[PDB]
């Protein structure tokens, strides 16, 4: 069984900005959902080997977690808000495209979903 390689969290080329509306996804936004109970399943790629989920890079072709999206607030990898925010709308949609509805990882999902949805309602204004 194989992995692919992970999302890019460093590229150099790639232009970078440090604003007020990614400052809030990192200290509102991933930490509320870092800290949650129902994280661990997202915290890190999605590892198809140890999970025994051989179908799971078959299905899933665009693959995100919060361990990638913490990275790229760390170190800076984003341009805008609405990259980070599609991030984690991708890792809540492979969730739902992969599994069986109603499974325990959905709910976990929609738990996370539900919070990330609150904290985004209230992004901040641009500085
Ligand atoms: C018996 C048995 C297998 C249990 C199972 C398989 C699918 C699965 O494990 N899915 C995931 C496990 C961890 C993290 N995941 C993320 C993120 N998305 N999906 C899963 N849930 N029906």
Redesign the pocket.
């Given at each position: 069984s194989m992995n692919p390689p992970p999302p890019e969290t460093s590229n150099p080329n790639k232009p970078k900005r440090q604003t007020n509306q990614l400052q809030y996804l990192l200290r509102v936004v991933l930490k509320t959902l870092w800290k949650h109970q129902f994280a661990w399943?997202?915290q890190q790629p999605?590892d198809a080997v140890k999970?025994n989920?051989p179908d799971y890079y078959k299905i899933i072709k665009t693959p995100m977690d919060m361990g990638t999206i913490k990275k790229r607030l760390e170190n800076n990898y984003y341009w805008n808000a609405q990259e980070c925010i599609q991030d984690f709308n991708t890792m809540f949609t492979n969730?739902y495209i992969?599994?069986?509805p109603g499974?325990d990882?959905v709910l976990m999902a929609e738990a996370l979903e539900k919070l990330f949805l609150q904290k985004i309602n209230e992004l901040p204004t641009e500085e």
């Open positions: 399943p997202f999605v999970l989920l969730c992969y599994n069986k499974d990882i």
